[PDB]
Design a protein around this ligand. Structure first.
Ligand SMILES: O=C(O)c1cc(-c2ccc(F)c(Cl)c2)cc(NS(=O)(=O)c2ccc(-c3ccccc3)cc2)c1O
Ligand SMILES: O=C(O)c1cc(-c2ccc(F)c(Cl)c2)cc(NS(=O)(=O)c2ccc(-c3ccccc3)cc2)c1O
Ligand SMILES: [Cl-]
Lengths: 233, 237
């Protein structure tokens, strides 16, 4: 029975997890850092051991992983970072709070976006205050023109995450390597969807909690042999 | 020049404060060591340095130094490669002894021999050593052949197992134009400086690298330094 563990980072600075932070590289808030500590301590009290870690290229996920690896005295582990595990790209909405989103686009369009699986929000355009900050970030310079999103539907997000799971993470798990994934709600969502074979309506309802380890036990075909478990209280 | 390389040696560890031999023991930075790294990182930030790949040991006092630097220069997203081959020199049986216990037990003449020689290792870490299993049975070394896992190391041993990693895994990255950062330890960095500068044994044994301070090499396309190593920081530092 393979053992797999996911963790989702906690709160970021300037309330950005409630402002469609997306591909903006918001750091963790102090509270989010503390959550990561607690998730780490939990993994330590339970004596978990990993052999390799996967994360995104966004600092709030990376710091969550650093914090965890610190807590469990495993900062020596190999770490692979990939843009394919980034949070969903929210296009023009990146940085808007809920009221500003409604004011600028109207309630009807917002609802359709909230509930649609393959309707992207509007793309982030060059006068967006995050446009060059994200799309001209060195860390994406190896991405083809069609790989760099200006916006993403949830389906887009999953479609770009799944290839990295297939080609990079599955082979590690199959070799018996205990894997830890520190990433974001919507990239984790694609992994949980493909694991449990969930529906679009189902994955759009799943609300993964932040800062607590998410344990999977999988059979020899990478299928869950029970539901997901949490670690802590 | 064609290429630029940055090295950094970690600062003070918890066992430095106890003046104990660490070697492969995985001692964490002291708070002052952590601040050293923050200043080093800040010096890299103020000079606008950019990297593409990082290499480090599997010892937390180097890894945390690298973490602290990547944080300071806002490049936490960079790929990072960890390897035992960049570990501090293994001090064998002296591991965990402090200065007084070492002097008391072995005397000045024998210690002076050890300090001044290049290919004379200290006594091996025997299985009844108090840190034998904490180090030699630590699972981070499970992939090592019985020949690779040292019981003790001369400086020549440490450089001999460091240089293969620099030839096989760092040189290709450099010749590929990747801007490299190595965060490691005094004696593994000694291997690299010895190789880059063609220094003699006598010279390398006399070389003490500053800690928590960015060490900058300007290399030509053959990886030959074109000037002496430079340091980044304020006038005093
Ligand atoms: O003034 C003196 O009489 C004098 C005496 C000694 C001395 C005395 C008793 C001993 F048992 C030994 Cl081993 C050395 C040392 C120095 N200074 S030193 O040569 O630079 C020197 C510093 C430190 C270490 C050391 C470090 C770590 C572990 C073990 C030894 C060895 C040498 C003296 O000026
Ligand atoms: O850098 C070098 O190449 C170097 C290497 C050695 C050395 C090497 C192998 C050995 F087996 C022994 Cl026993 C010593 C010694 C000195 N000089 S020293 O004065 O003797 C000296 C020794 C040890 C400490 C120390 C001990 C514990 C914690 C923190 C510091 C300080 C000072 C060197 O400059
Ligand atoms: Cl890392």
């Amino acid at each position: 029975a393979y053992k797999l563990v996911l963790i989702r980072h906690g709160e970021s600075a300037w309330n950005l997890e409630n402002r469609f932070s997306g591909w903006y590289d918001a750091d963790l808030s102090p509270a989010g850092h503390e959550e990561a500590k607690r998730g780490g301590q939990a993994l330590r009290d339970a004596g978990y051991e990993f052999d390799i870690c996967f994360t995104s290229v966004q600092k709030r996920a990376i710091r969550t992983l650093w914090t965890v690896l610190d807590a469990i005295d495993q900062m020596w582990l190999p770490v692979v970072r990939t843009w394919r595990l980034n949070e969903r790209h929210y296009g023009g909405l990146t940085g808007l709070n809920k009221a500003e989103t409604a004011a600028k686009h109207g309630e009807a369009q917002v609802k359709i976006w909230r509930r649609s699986y393959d309707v992207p929000p509007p793309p982030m355009e060059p006068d967006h205050p995050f446009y060059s900050n994200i799309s001209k970030d060195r860390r994406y310079a190896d991405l083809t023109e069609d790989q760099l999103p200006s916006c993403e539907s949830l389906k887009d997000t999953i479609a770009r995450a799944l290839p990295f799971w297939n080609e990079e993470i599955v082979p590690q798990i199959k070799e018996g390597k205990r894997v830890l994934i520190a990433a974001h709600g919507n990239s984790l969502r694609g992994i949980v969807k493909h694991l449990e074979g969930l529906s679009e309506e189902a994955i759009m309802e799943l609300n993964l909690p932040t800062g607590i380890p998410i344990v999977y036990e999988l059979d020899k075909n990478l299928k869950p042999i029970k539901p997901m478990q949490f670690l802590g209280d």
